Structure formats: structure tokens, C-alpha cells
Design a protein around this nucleic acid. Structure first.
Ligand SMILES: Nc1nc2c(ncn2[C@@H]2O[C@H](COP(=O)(O)OP(=O)(O)OP(=O)(O)O)[C@@H](O)[C@H]2O)c(=O)[nH]1
Ligand SMILES: [Mg+2]
Lengths: 488, 69, 72, 94, 220, 80, 82, 82, 75
RNA sequence: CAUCCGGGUGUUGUCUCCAUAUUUUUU
């Protein structure tokens, strides 16, 4: 009646990457990264999360034949009767899973999908308080609207690194029917409009900051990823990265010679149109409108993609999705961009200083975590907590102080707390909860049993001596971004 | 091409182990892709300084240890 | 301005003395030619074993990797 | 690949690589000092960039010296491949 | 090739046959391609209308299902401002009326469509910058020769059958498919989309009431 | 000891391999990964030095062996 | 790219041991690695070839000098191989 | 110009080898790499005054190989030309 | 920041008192002044002097020393 | 709470038509 949720533990999805090796990488605190997926309403962030979910698991049981074929999107993290019927994420949900970058180094990432409607900004304020970096997903048709502008101003305010995913790239092609040069000018307009609100930092597709994606057709790429697949087995290997820095922004190419003027003879396009964008238009046009016998030969010769004999008998939209998922493989370019965005050394200290009264340090022995919200997740209620320091074990009694007390308790520390035992700890996964015995520093978990101790948020601390009581500093309460002003 | 990330160790004193059990103390001035250490010369292993500003070759490096934290 | 490779090009057709690393010996003969690798060739090269001419080797071709230093 | 081999043979003939190339052309016995002390008297057959050289008519000369007993040892081989790094000084015997 | 056999159970066509059947069946196509057309005429607004006993201005009218009919909503104390007309009570049905019994929640929106059609003269290409659209205002390094992008050997971006593909790509049900199975002849409801869309023009009273009666039958 | 008449090194991967080293030691274990520069990744590497009498023995587990400091490779035993 | 060097960089963070050409072993948290194994460690014990242990905070090493690196049992599992 | 061509063309020949230390190696040329790595099947080793240590299979590192004593029935000029 | 190429360009123009240590070698040092520079680390040194180590001033002149066997430089 | 016009998929049978190298690897 309320959620769609996986209650039988035996019916869990079967996790291609061996979750025990995922939990083993939680010991190193630099291996974990917390990213929240924010953006505007109906821009694609849930389907973007759903791509990663589909590619991370072996057999999802809730996946029907239609969401395999690509007619209806599996909205895996929507999960509620509200969010299925309304068609709208109203509560934040997440998934913790491991992902590999382009250099094959795997790391554990905690994705928090957040709502995009503007009434639900309490949720987005929770996601900005949780996340190390955010990946703002915007759609290409609307541009960087006023909502996008406010989301990047709040990403700057919270001392949070950020990344951009240009979404809905098919609507340039199929819906609006723009020519490839005009769509290049549209993309350069969006990026040059992104850089106007960002104070000083530079977002370009060649700095692993801008990621082009469909998520209805189910691809994503970067210029670095797209050179790394099909181009850079031909370039001499000392030139590869330098060639990628040639792939943007009014540098023109003819016959092995790069220059900047329009070259006056061949009437070619700029290099991003010629190398990346026109092959993308050709993949779409030839998937939808070329006879399959020529298409499988051409596509085997160019991309080494072998179209199966089943996949010739499709409808045009599943066939386009199938071709585009075989040209553009699993989302390693996005994960590589996430790894290249976040430096912990620059921003973890400023983020804890912004959340809670800048001190020198916390002792490594004490347990110090931040109970963000009470979330009804799977029948019973779980707290949702990020662990800033120390270790937490199942069966440990800790002090949970409500955050409204904290602005007084902090001045009293400059000049009692009720305790609760941690009954269960689980990793959030979408339609399920994976039970875990202990939770380390730097990761986001769900804790059953402390929910009766606070209203909206809390801080969780376990002190070892008496002397570290004066060292510890409490979290300030949230800036739920919109003031509630509509009364009944 | 892969630049050894010595910008964490830039402008800091370092105990450079080099060929034949020889040590070099000295604050770092710069470097290159071959790991050739450009450093302000200090006492060489009781102890005695040779030179004012030194450039050690990468091939001769055994190690370089963080004297300063 | 006096670099090694242009002085080496001037040192062509001139007497040179070669010293090496391990199991090594000084020499003394007229340099014939050189390349970017610094492979040497001498005529009338005398095998100065620690500054003592053990034998007049004459027409010889020295390898590049074992070279330590070259002098007058 | 072809232009590099053209400038290879060009740079051999003019540079000092011509010497033992001319020794191979004249096909004489040549002595070569070695890293592990072996004066190799042999007929040069092959010749490359790295100074790796196949040797016909081989006659290695050395001294297996241990026990206060100088036993100047030597052996004949039919054909042998030389690695470059082992070489110290090649020389053509007049 | 175009059928399984004389048992006549499954069908699969090419693109030009399917496009030809798309053009040829113009008078009975749906020709509504965005889902925001059915804002307050979807099935679930009809269910909320039956349950709440309201009448959206062009649809059916049922019985109450709760036919039996304090000083909280008195006149002195409520601020009369922006009347609470029946479309608001249908759209947000837990906020605008007390006691919503047997009410379900009706799919907030679909984003905004900007599909552009191309039907004039056919000689315009597939990819063309429409007049509706706003404008978008404002040697150390070399590679080997014969280095060219991926599909440069096939020089045409726009194939001839691709305008038909981009038109069939958006058609609602039977035509975006090109593969399927045979149904019965009476199971193909040809008049059905007509009374689900709206009245096409301004009709007589009898013809506007006929839409409502058939549309009530669909809801039941 | 038994082994197939193999063509190259990569074809006999995951075989228990005696691997000599320039410093005098020998590393014995099942090889997981090789390289262009002969860097090796032994699954169950075992450190065996030859001291100046009888063999020195020590267990390592999963270890990278750098290629430059290898002398040669020898097949010790089969997989599994 | 070198699949053993791939493994090394993936092994960053774990308590890894390291012996050089000199024969002096090390053991601590890894920090940095590259194509040429330009290794960095934290909390590193530095046992000399004789056996003289000297605990120290950090170290940087050049790849030419490295002999072999003791990786833990976690990299046996995933995800570099398949 | 490449002797690597010749050494590649040397196949299935039983040959002696010397190393940097000077170890002998009697075995069939299974294959030779472009950087001299001598892949050898059916091999026999003897150290430098020392007794026999015969083995089944050995691929030896290219740089460690000092000097390969070739067999008797061998036309050098036949393989040198393309 | 100063790469080795730029610090040796200072040693090139200055020609100040250089002391060189040698690769795979503890028994001997050099004392002269830098005069040349190659794209490799080869440098010709005028007024060079062979200086055995403090466990004297022995004879040596101007030398093109193959720079791949260098350890120290300090002008 | 039932009746009726229909539908999918699987296994077996049956029927029809054809067929038998010049600093980290290696100079
Ligand atoms: N035309 C088109 N639609 C897309 C594309 N990607 C996603 N969508 C649609 O966008 C709608 C919104 O998708 P969601 O991801 O579920 O919405 P959201 O981003 O989570 O925004 P929320 O309402 O907060 O969930 C879905 O109905 C998708 O069909 C695309 O590339 N092209
Ligand atoms: Mg959503």
C-alpha cells in the first residue's frame, strides 16, 4: 500500500561487484565519496541514477520487459506510492555502490538522489549537507534557469565541489531537429552561461567537468571517455591527452594540421562538431533509418560493436537504445569525472567548519556523526547519518543531541544528553536495505533505534574520556532553503 | 609525462637517500619528470655541508624521506 | 655557449682520453667520430691502466654506456 | 620506418659505427673486451643499432681465477650472439 | 518475411511500409503527441471527479457515492480571495476539499513538449532550423595524415527515409512500433480516441452531450 | 614437475611459477598479471632467499614483483 | 597500461610493504603511485638491510629502486581482473 | 638492420646461453621476444665449476641474457636477408 | 619553482664554483665550474679538478664528462 | 461474488510441404 520494497532478504539484487569487496574498501576513508544528485524538476536525475543501478546489479527482480526494452523508465529510487502515481520524487533516496574510473581504480560512492520540484527543498538542503560533491543535472532544452542558478549558488555556499551533466541530448536531435552546428552553438551557450554564475572556477568539457547524457536512450560520455574508447587506439600514445585538449572551443582541423582560423578551403566545422557531435548524429540517424544489413557491417567496422541476431528484430526506439548502449558503454566517464572533481584536503575541513563552528581538529578516538533526517524507509523508520569521525558498532550506546539544543550547548562548552543504543545499521540501496555490522568514517548509513531522541536533525557523539568533552563541537541546524510560508 | 607529485614536498627539508648509502638534507627548490631534485644544499653524511644550491640526478636517487611534516 | 656536443664536434679528429666505471681503464688516442649516443672511435688508442699504457690498442670502437668521462 | 633505416645506414657510414661495419665488410677477426672480462676473438657476421653482433669463428679469452691458481681459460664456439651492454671496447686486429 | 504464417498471429514490417500506412491513415490517427494535453481529462481526474462529486466542464457526471450530506468554515473568519473553483479541487484533491474519500492522486506533469513538425512541401530537410526557434546569439602539434573522424566514409548525414523515421518516432501507439501481433477486428477501437480528446469544434448541444455519455461509458 | 609445451608466458598464467630475482631470492607462486616490462603479480607469492648453507623461507601472499629485478621465470606446478 | 602498475595504484591506502634493490624493507599506508612507480607512504617503518628498524612519518621512493611490493589480500578479490 | 629479425627467425633450435652472472642454459628456442626475452622449452641449467640443475620450462628475461651460443647447422646469411 | 634545466642555466651563465659527485662512485669527486649544457644531462666543465674524498688537489683540466653518470652539481 | 467473448507462454502428440639503446624496467 505504501512502498514497493524488498522484504525477503533472499530476493536481493545480486550485485556484480561482490559487495564484501565493497565493504572492505570502506576502511580507507579516501576511498569513499558522497555525491548528491540535485537539479531541477523533470531533468533526468532519477533515470541517471537508474542507469548506474542497472549496470551495478545482475538481476533486478522488479525489472519488467518494457523497462528492459526501453519504453518506460524504471524509476528504481522513486519507490513510493506517491512517487509512482504523482510521477515525482518527493523524498530523497539513495544507493551505495562501488564504481570504477577510466584508470580501473574502484571506489565506493554514496549517491543521494534528491527531488527536483521546488517545494521539496528541505530534501535538497539535506542532500547538500550530506554530500562531498554534487553533480547538478540540467536539461539541454531549458538551459541554466533560475532554479539551476540557485542550486549552484547553494553548492558554492556549502563548500561543496560540483559537476555538471548536460541531459536530454536527444531533444536537440529528435524533438527540435537542430543541425549539428546549431546544436554546438546551443551547447557552448549553456556552458558559457554556467561559467557566468560560478565565481572564478572554469567549467569546460575538457576539464572533466561537463558530461553529456541522454538517460532515456541510456548513454553518457565525456570527451576523455570518448577519445579513450574509439579514437586513442590510433593516436601515438604520448599525444592522447593533448589531443583531448584540442577537442573544444574553435580550433579547426583538416588533414593532420590543427589551427584556429576557418581554414578557407574545406568549409569544415569546428573540431567538436567533426569528431564527436556529427558521429553522434550519424549514430542516431543510421539507427533509426538505415537498412540493418548495411548498419551491422558499418557498425562492426567502426566501433567493433557486434549486433546480435535477436537485436535486429526490434522497434526503432529500443533499437536506438540498444545501439547507443553498445557504442557508449558503462558509466565510467562520469565516475572518472567525479574522481577528478573532489579533493578531500581542500574542502572537508571547510565543510565541517561551515556546518559546525570551526575548531582545530577532532580527536581520532571519539565518535562524531551527523544525523541528517528521519526517513521512513521500508516500513519502519531509520535515521540517516553521516559519520564524520571515529567508528560506530552495532550495540553501542551513544549520545544523540537534538540540534536545537546545540547552539546553547556550544556556548556552554565555550564557557546530560540522552543516550540510545544502535539497534541496526544498514546501507541504503533503493528498494532494499543491506544489513552491515559496523560503519566506518566517511560513509552514509541508516541507523535504526535513535529516532525517538530528536526532531528534524541531531548530532551523534560518543566520547571516551572526560577531557574530550570540551574538544567536541556540535552541528548547527540546517538551512532548509525555502522558508515555509504557505499556511493551512 | 606523469609528473611526480612533489608539490606536497615543495619548499620543505628532505632526507634524500642516494647511491652508496649517502644522504642529502636540504629544502626543495624544484624538480622534473626524471625526479632530478633541485634543492638548497645542506649537511651531507659526523656531518658537513658541500655547496649552497644543489641539483641531484634522478638515477642516483634511492629515496627521499619527509624530514618536515 | 661552449656546450658538450659542439665541443665534441670540435674534438673530432683530435686526441682524447676515455675513462669508464667498473673493470675500467684510461685511454689516449685520436678521436675519429661521434654520434648522439656518444659511441667513440679512436686511432692509436693507448690503454692507460690507471695512467699506465698497458698496450697500444690502435684502431678501436668504444661503447657508449660504459663511458664515464672524456678529456685531453 | 624506412626513412629511419635510411638515416641509420647513412649515420653508420659517416659516424663511428662505420668502423666495425667496415670490419664486418672486410670480414676479419676482431678482439672485444667484455663487462665480465672476456677478450672475444671472432668473425663479425651481424651488426645493428644497439651493437648486438652475431659472431662466427668464435674464440673467447679469459681467466677463471680462484685458489691462487692462475688458469687462463679459453674456448672455441661455432656461432654466438653478443648482447650490446656486455661490450666495452671493440677493436679490429691488424 | 512480413508475417509468421497462415495462422496469421504476428507481423513485422519495414520502415517505408509503416510510413506509408502512417500517411495513408491520416483521418483516423490520434494526432496528439504530448501527454500534457490530457491535463484534467486523464482517467484519474475522472475517478476523482466521480469520487468527489464535481464536474470538470466538458466531461461526465455520475452519482455521489456518498449521498448522505460548528463554526470552522464560517464567513466571518475565512478570507475570501481567489475562488476555489472545481478544477483546483480535482487537481490537488487532498488540499482543497475536506473529506476526500476514495480519491487517487493524478500525475503532476510532463515537462513541456517542443517537438517540431515538418509537413510543408517535403523538400525541406529533416534537420532544419525552424522559424519558431529563437537564435543563439554571441604549428607545434600535428597528427598523422589520413586521420579522420569515425563515420567519415559514409558522407551523408541525412538519409532519405529519415524524415519518416523521425515522424514515426513520435506517433502515439500503433505506428511507432513496426513489430507486433495481430488482434481481433472488433478490438480496434477507431472512434475511441475521438471522445477522449475533446470536441473538435463548437458543435450543437446534442453532439456535446453525446461525447459526455460515451465518455461516461469509458469511465465505468 | 610437469607443464604443457607452451608458446608464450601469458598462455600459462595462473600457474605456480618459480621466479628468480637479481638480488639472490626466488619468488614462488601462482601468477595473476604480467606486463610489457615484465612486472608480475603473484597470487600466492612466497619469499625464498638463498643465504650463504640452506634455503631461507617466508610467505608473502598477493605481491607485485617489479620486472627489472627479475632474472627469469620457471614453471613450478599446475593451477588449482 | 601496465596491469601490475594498475594494481599498485588501486592498492593505495592499504598498509603495504616495500623492499628495494638495497634490501631495506618498508611497511605503511600507501599514498601515491604513477606509471614509473613513484611511491609515497605514511606511518612507514623503515627496516635497514641489517634489521635496524626506524619508525618515521612518511617516505617517497623512485620506481627504479623498487624490488617488490607486498599488497594485502583484498586486491585478490576485485575489481581489476574481471 | 634489426638483429631482432634474425633472433625472431631463430626458432626451435637447441642453444647454450650465458647470463650477467654467467649461468649456462641448454634448451630449444621456443620463441624470442622483440626485447630479447628467450622463451625456452626442455631446458638444462649449470652455474659458473658447479653441478647440473635441469628443468622443464624457462622463459628468461632479455637483459639478463648475456651471450647465446648458437647450434652447428646454421646458415647466418640465409636468415639475415628478407 | 625551479626545474633542473633552469637552475643549470643559472650555472651556465654564472660559471661559479661547481663541485660534482659521480654515479656508482664514492671514491672520487670533481671540483670545477659549469660551462656547457646538453638536452641530456651532459655538461662540459672547464677548470675541473679531480678531488679524492675526505675519508689534496690532484691534476685535471677541461672535460666533456658523459652526463648520464652524474650525481651532484653545486655552483 | 459468478457466467460469457477472447489472449500469452511452456512440454508432448499429430498433420502438410520440402529434404535424406642515450635517468624508472629491455642496452
Ligand atoms: N524526451 C526525453 N525525456 C527524458 C530524457 N531523460 C529523461 N526524460 C524524461 O524526463 C522525465 C523525468 O525523469 P525523472 O528522472 O524521473 O525526473 P527527475 O529528474 O527525477 O525530476 P523529479 O521530478 O524530481 O524526479 C521522465 O518522464 C523521463 O521520461 C531524455 O533524454 N529525453
Ligand atoms: Mg527524481
Amino acid at each position: 500500500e505504501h512502498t514497493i520494497f524488498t522484504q525477503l532478504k533472499k530476493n536481493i539484487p545480486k550485485t556484480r561487484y561482490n559487495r564484501d569487496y565493497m565493504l572492505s574498501m570502506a576502511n580507507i576513508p579516501e576511498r569513499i565519496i558522497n555525491v548528491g544528485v540535485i537539479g531541477p524538476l523533470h531533468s533526468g536525475k532519477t533515470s541517471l541514477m537508474d542507469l548506474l543501478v542497472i549496470d551495478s546489479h545482475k538481476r533486478i527482480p522488479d525489472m519488467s520487459k518494457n523497462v528492459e526494452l526501453g519504453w518506460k523508465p524504471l524509476r528504481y529510487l522513486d519507490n513510493l506510492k506517491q512517487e509512482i502515481d504523482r510521477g515525482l520524487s518527493i523524498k530523497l533516496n539513495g544507493s551505495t555502490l562501488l564504481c570504477t574510473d577510466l584508470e580501473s581504480k574502484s571506489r565506493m560512492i554514496n549517491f543521494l538522489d534528491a527531488p527536483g520540484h521546488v517545494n521539496f527543498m528541505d530534501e535538497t538542503a539535506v542532500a547538500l549537507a550530506a554530500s562531498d560533491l554534487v553533480l547538478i543535472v540540467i536539461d539541454v532544452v531549458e538551459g541554466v534557469t533560475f532554479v539551476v542558478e540557485q542550486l549552484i549558488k547553494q553548492s558554492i555556499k556549502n563548500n561543496v565541489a560540483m559537476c555538471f551533466v548536460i541531459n536530454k541530448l536527444d531533444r536537440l536531435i529528435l524533438d527540435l531537429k537542430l543541425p549539428p552546428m546549431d546544436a554546438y552553438l546551443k551547447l557552448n551557450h549553456i556552458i558559457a552561461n554556467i561559467n557566468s554564475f560560478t565565481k572564478g572556477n572554469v567549467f569546460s568539457p575538457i576539464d572533466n567537468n561537463i558530461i553529456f547524457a541522454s538517460t532515456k536512450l541510456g548513454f553518457t560520455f565525456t570527451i576523455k571517455e570518448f577519445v579513450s574508447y574509439y579514437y586513442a587506439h590510433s593516436i601515438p600514445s604520448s599525444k592522447i591527452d593533448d589531443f583531448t585538449t584540442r577537442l573544444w572551443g574553435s580550433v579547426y582541423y583538416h588533414k593532420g594540421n590543427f589551427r584556429t582560423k576557418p581554414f578557407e578551403n574545406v568549409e569544415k566545422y569546428p573540431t567538436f562538431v567533426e569528431f564527436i557531435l556529427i558521429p553522434l548524429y550519424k549514430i542516431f540517424s543510421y539507427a533509426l533509418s538505415m537498412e540493418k544489413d548495411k548498419l551491422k557491417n558499418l557498425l562492426r567496422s567502426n566501433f567493433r560493436v557486434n549486433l546480435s541476431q535477436e537485436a535486429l528484430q526490434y522497434d526503432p526506439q529500443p533499437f536506438l537504445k540498444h545501439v547507443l548502449q553498445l557504442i557508449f558503454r558503462q558509466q565510467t566517464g562520469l565516475v572518472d569525472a567525479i574522481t577528478r572533481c573532489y579533493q578531500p584536503f581542500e574542502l572537508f575541513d571547510n565543510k565541517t567548519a561551515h556546518l559546525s563552528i570551526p575548531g582545530k581538529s577532532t580527536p581520532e578516538g571519539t565518535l562524531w556523526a551527523h544525523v541528517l533526517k528521519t526517513v521512513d524507509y521500508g516500513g519502519a523508520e531509520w535515521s540517516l547519518v553521516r559519520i564524520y569521525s571515529g567508528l560506530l558498532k552495532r550495540g553501542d550506546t551513544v549520545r544523540i543531541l537534538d540540534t536545537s539544543q546545540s547552539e546553547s550547548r556550544q556556548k556552554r562548552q565555550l564557557h546530560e544528553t540522552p543516550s540510545c543504543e544502535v539497534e541496526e545499521i544498514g546501507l541504503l540501496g533503493g528498494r532494499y536495505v543491506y544489513p552491515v555490522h559496523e560503519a566506518h568514517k566517511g560513509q552514509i548509513v541508516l541507523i535504526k533505534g535513535i529516532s525517538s531522541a530528536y526532531i528534524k536533525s541531531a548530532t551523534l557523539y560518543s566520547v571516551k574520556s572526560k577531557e574530550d568533552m570540551k574538544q567536541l563541537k556540535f552541528f548547527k541546524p540546517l538551512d532548509y532553503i525555502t522558508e515555509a510560508v504557505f499556511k493551512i | 609525462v606523469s609528473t611526480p607529485e612533489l608539490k606536497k614536498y615543495m619548499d620543505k627539508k628532505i632526507l634524500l637517500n642516494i647511491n652508496g648509502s649517502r644522504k642529502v638534507a636540504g629544502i626543495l627548490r624544484g624538480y622534473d619528470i626524471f625526479l632530478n631534485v633541485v634543492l638548497d644544499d645542506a649537511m651531507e653524511i659526523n656531518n658537513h655541508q658541500l655547496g649552497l644550491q644543489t641539483v641531484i640526478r634522478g638515477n642516483s636517487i634511492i629515496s627521499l624521506e619527509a624530514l618536515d611534516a | 655557449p661552449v656546450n658538450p656536443k659542439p665541443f665534441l664536434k670540435g674534438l673530432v679528429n683530435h686526441r682524447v682520453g676515455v675513462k669508464l666505471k667498473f673493470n675500467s681503464t684510461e685511454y689516449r688516442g685520436t678521436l675519429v667520430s661521434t654520434d648522439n649516443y656518444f659511441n667513440l672511435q679512436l686511432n692509436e688508442a693507448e690503454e692507460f691502466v690507471a695512467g699506465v699504457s698497458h698496450g697500444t690498442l690502435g684502431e678501436i670502437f668504444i661503447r657508449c654506456n660504459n663511458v664515464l668521462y672524456i678529456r685531453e | 620506418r624506412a626513412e629511419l633505416e635510411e638515416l641509420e645506414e647513412f649515420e653508420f657510414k659517416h659516424g663511428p659505427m662505420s668502423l666495425i661495419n667496415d670490419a664486418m665488410v672486410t670480414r676479419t677477426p676482431v678482439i672485444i673486451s667484455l663487462r665480465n672480462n672476456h677478450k672475444i676473438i671472432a668473425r663479425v657476421k651481424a651488426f645493428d643499432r644497439h651493437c648486438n653482433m652475431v659472431l662466427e669463428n668464435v674464440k673467447e679469452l679469459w681467466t677463471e681465477k680462484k685458489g691462487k691458481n692462475v688458469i687462463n681459460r679459453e674456448r672455441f664456439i661455432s656461432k654466438l650472439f653478443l648482447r650490446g651492454d656486455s661490450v666495452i671496447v671493440v677493436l679490429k686486429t691488424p | 518475411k512480413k508475417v509468421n504464417g497462415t495462422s496469421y498471429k504476428k507481423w513485422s514490417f519495414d520502415l517505408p511500409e509503416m510510413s506509408n500506412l502512417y500517411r495513408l491513415s491520416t483521418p483516423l490517427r490520434d494526432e496528439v503527441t504530448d501527454k500534457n494535453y490530457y491535463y484534467l481529462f486523464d482517467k484519474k481526474s475522472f475517478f476523482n471527479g466521480k469520487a468527489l462529486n464535481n464536474a470538470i466542464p466538458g466531461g461526465p457526471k455520475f452519482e455521489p457515492l456518498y449521498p448522505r450530506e460548528n463554526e470552522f468554515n464560517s464567513i466571518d473568519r475565512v478570507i475570501f480571495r481567489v475562488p476555489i473553483r472545481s478544477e483546483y479541487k480535482v487537481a490537488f484533491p487532498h488540499l482543497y476539499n475536506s473529506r476526500p474519500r476514495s480519491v487517487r492522486i493524478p500525475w503532476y506533469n510532463n515537462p513541456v513538449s517542443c517537438i517540431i513538425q515538418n509537413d510543408e512541401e517535403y523538400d525541406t530537410p529533416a534537420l532544419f532550423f525552424d522559424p519558431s526557434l529563437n537564435p543563439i546569439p554571441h604549428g607545434d602539434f600535428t597528427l598523422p595524415e589520413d586521420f579522420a573522424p569515425l563515420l567519415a566514409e559514409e558522407e551523408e548525414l541525412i538519409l532519405p527515409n529519415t524524415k519518416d523515421a523521425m515522424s514515426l518516432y513520435h506517433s502515439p501507439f500503433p505506428f511507432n512500433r513496426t513489430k507486433g501481433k495481430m488482434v481481433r477486428a472488433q478490438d480496434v477501437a477507431l472512434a475511441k480516441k475521438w471522445f477522449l480528446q475533446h470536441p473538435d469544434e463548437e458543435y450543437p448541444v446534442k453532439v456535446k452531450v453525446s461525447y459526455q455519455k460515451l465518455l461516461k461509458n469509458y469511465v465505468l | 614437475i610437469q607443464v604443457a609445451h607452451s608458446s608464450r608466458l601469458a598462455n600459462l598464467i595462473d600457474y605456480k611459477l618459480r621466479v628468480l630475482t637479481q638480488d639472490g631470492r626466488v619468488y614462488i607462486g601462482q601468477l595473476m598479471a604480467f606486463d610489457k616490462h615484465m612486472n608480475l603479480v603473484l597470487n600466492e607469492c612466497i619469499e625464498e632467499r638463498v643465504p650463504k648453507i640452506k634455503v631461507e623461507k617466508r610467505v608473502l601472499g598477493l605481491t607485485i614483483l617489479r620486472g627489472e629485478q627479475i632474472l627469469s621465470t620457471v614453471v613450478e606446478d599446475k593451477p588449482l | 597500461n601496465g596491469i601490475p602498475v594498475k594494481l599498485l595504484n588501486e592498492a593505495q591506502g592499504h598498509i603495504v610493504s616495500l623492499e628495494l634493490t638495497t634490501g631495506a624493507t618498508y611497511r605503511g599506508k600507501l599514498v601515491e603511485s604513477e606509471d614509473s612507480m613513484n611511491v609515497q607512504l605514511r606511518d612507514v617503518i623503515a627496516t635497514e638491510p641489517q634489521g635496524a628498524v626506524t619508525h618515521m612519518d612518511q617516505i617517497f621512493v623512485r620506481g627504479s629502486q623498487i624490488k617488490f611490493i607486498v599488497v594485502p589480500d583484498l586486491l585478490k578479490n576485485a575489481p581489476l581482473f574481471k | 638492420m634489426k638483429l631482432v629479425n634474425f633472433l625472431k627467425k631463430l626458432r626451435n633450435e637447441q642453444v647454450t646461453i650465458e647470463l650477467k652472472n654467467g649461468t649456462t642454459v641448454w634448451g630449444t628456442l621456443q620463441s624470442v621476444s622483440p626485447q630479447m626475452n628467450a622463451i625456452l622449452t626442455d631446458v638444462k641449467l649449470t652455474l659458473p665449476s658447479d653441478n647440473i640443475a635441469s628443468l622443464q620450462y624457462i622463459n628468461i628475461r632479455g637483459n639478463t641474457i648475456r651471450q647465446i651460443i648458437l647450434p652447428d647447422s646454421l646458415n647466418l646469411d640465409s636468415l639475415l636477408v628478407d | 619553482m625551479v626545474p633542473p634545466i633552469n637552475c643549470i642555466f643559472n650555472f651556465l651563465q654564472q660559471q661559479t664554483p661547481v663541485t660534482i659527485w659521480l654515479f656508482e662512485q664514492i671514491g672520487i669527486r670533481i671540483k670545477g665550474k659549469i660551462v656547457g649544457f646538453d638536452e641530456f644531462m651532459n655538461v662540459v666543465i672547464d677548470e675541473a679538478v679531480e678531488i679524492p674524498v675526505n675519508s689534496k688537489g690532484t691534476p685535471l683540466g677541461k672535460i666533456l664528462l658523459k652526463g648520464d653518470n652524474i650525481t651532484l652539481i653545486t655552483s
